Amino acid sequence: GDNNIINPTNSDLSINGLVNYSKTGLQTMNETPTFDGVSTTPVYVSVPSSVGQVNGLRLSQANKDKLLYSRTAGPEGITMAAVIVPTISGAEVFNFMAIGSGFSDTSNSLHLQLVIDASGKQTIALLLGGDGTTQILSGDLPNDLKLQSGVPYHIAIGAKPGYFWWSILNIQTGKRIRRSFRGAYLAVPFNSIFGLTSSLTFFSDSNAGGDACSGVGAKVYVGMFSSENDYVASRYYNLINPVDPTKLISYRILDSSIHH
């Protein structure tokens, strides 16, 4: 899109009237998620020093580690973001984050996925189920845009009726990839994803069987809906911080703790 490499700055910058999270003392809500896994004890492992913390949450397919929020998506929409340091090897589906669960005409669900095939080809896929139908919006990444094993990425989505965007930002090089879907790209608006019935999950979805992720998670943010405009504007302050302190609903660093 327009901003393909983002270099953040410690200048005296104000962009889009957004409060820079690093410069704020405002008090906000901070909802608490529940850890879930096959074993329900969280495990923490180290992250690269670019993540700005010692450890993050260990993500594996075997234990299905994830963070469940009870909050459901509403018609104004939601933003969800996290640092994920993916371990990438063979065929795999990573569910980076989800609203609800399942995938059918009535699932009322969203999944953002990275799918690696057996040959190493990578696809980014957004799965929408609801309003009587389903849609897969996916694309195969060219070789030079592929995610790299052990590199941290800031991964974000904005999702509301009729309006879905996703972004994947390498925090070491500033290089970003993204897509946005409105209008004729969507088969329906997917209103029923946002009927206050489908809850938010990081690193899997809200069903016990769902695919999860492999690697490490950190700096989980839930906010009310931000445009990609405002998401990108906020990246000029810092590549991994919360998007919009005035819309922040949860933010958990996950440095060996689910608290704050």
Partner 1 sequence: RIIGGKFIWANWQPYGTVGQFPGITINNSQNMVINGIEVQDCGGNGIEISESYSISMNGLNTNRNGINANNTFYNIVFNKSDAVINGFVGLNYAANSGSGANSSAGNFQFLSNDCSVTINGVVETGYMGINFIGDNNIINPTNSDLSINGLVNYSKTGLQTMNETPTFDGVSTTPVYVSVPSSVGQVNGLRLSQANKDKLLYSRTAGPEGITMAAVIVPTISGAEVFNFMAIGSGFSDTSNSLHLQLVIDASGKQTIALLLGGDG
The residues that touch partner 1, with contacts defined as CB under 8 A, are 17, 26-30, 75-77, 160-163, 182-183, 189, 223-225, 227, 229, 245-249
Binding mask 231-260 for Cl ion (x = CB under 5 A): --------------------------xx--
39 versus 257: smaller Cβ distance to Cl ion = 257
SS3 71: strand
Pairing verdict, β 55-59 and 215-223: antiparallel
77 versus 130: smaller Cβ distance to partner 1 = 77
Residue 36 annotated in ligand binding: yes
Q: Does 43 bind Cl ion (CB under 5 A)?
A: no
Q: Least separation, in Å, of the C-beta of 227 and partner 1?
A: 5
Beta bridge partners of 95: 113
By a kind-dependent CB cut-off of 5 to 8 A, residue 171 interacts, out of Cl ion, partner 1, none, with none
By a kind-dependent CB cut-off of 5 to 8 A, residue 258 interacts, out of partner 1, Cl ion, none, with Cl ion
67 versus 124: smaller Cβ distance to Cl ion = 67
Instruction: Give the integer Cα–Cα distance in Å for 44 and 55.
Output: 6
Residue 67 near residue 186 (C-beta atoms within 8 A): no
188 versus 258: smaller Cβ distance to Cl ion = 258
List Cβ neighbours of 12 (8 Å cut-off, separation of 6 or more).
none
Distances (CA, A) of 168 to 12, 75, 112: 26, 25, 11
- The neighbour count for residue 121, using CB atoms within 10 Å, is 13
Structure-block tokens of residue 165 = 């965007």
Residues of this chain that interact with Cl ion (CB under 5 A) are: 257-258
- Residue ranges at the known binding site: 36, 105, 111, 205, 230
